[PDB]
Structures are given as structure tokens and as C-alpha cells.
RNA sequence: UUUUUUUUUUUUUUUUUUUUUUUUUUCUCCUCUUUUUUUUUUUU
């Protein structure tokens, strides 16, 4: 759903920020969409303030 | 619920020269009447 699929974005993106495998590369198969799901998530901030 | 790839505005430059206005034709051709020719001279 559209206020469900941002649970499953902050579902994957919790499982696997704790671990060491932060890293990740999602194979999105639309320049469309592609967009719409940075779009919708506006806030991970996974960045040092030295970096 | 619609991905990936398809180049672009020709290269060149560090060659010598010791002439001179013009330029080139036109043929022979019946002159009508008072004359010898007057004359010094002086006032500018």
C-alpha cells in the first residue's frame, strides 16, 4: 500500500542498518518509480558529521 | 507495471621576378581690268 510499502522501506532499512551490511543497492526496475522512492522517505540520515 | 545503447565543427604555410610618352595613309587644284609704281617740303 502507499502508506505500507514506507513499512516495508523501514522495515529492510532496520534489519540491516544495525548490521554491518548498511551498504545496499536496490535494483529498482523503473526510471519512474525509481524517484518516488527516495522521494517518499525523507529521512535516514545515515552520515557522520565528519564525513 | 515500459529497461539498455547508438564518437565529431579540412590537415598545411617561413613564395623568386632585372620596365617606360606615342604606336598606322588620302590626289592634282584659272586670285578679273586707269597706270607708270607715288616719293622734296613743314607742323607729332
Redesign the pocket.
Same mark, same amino acid.
Given at each position: 500500500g502507499p502508506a505500507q510499502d514506507r513499512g516495508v522501506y523501514l522495515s529492510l532499512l532496520a534489519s540491516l542498518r544495525t548490521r554491518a551490511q548498511l551498504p545496499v543497492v536496490v535494483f529498482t526496475?523503473? =526510471?519512474? =518509480?525509481c524517484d518516488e522512492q527516495a522521494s517518499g522517505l525523507t529521512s535516514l540520515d545515515l552520515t557522520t558529521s565528519s564525513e
Open positions: 526496475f523503473s =526510471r519512474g =518509480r
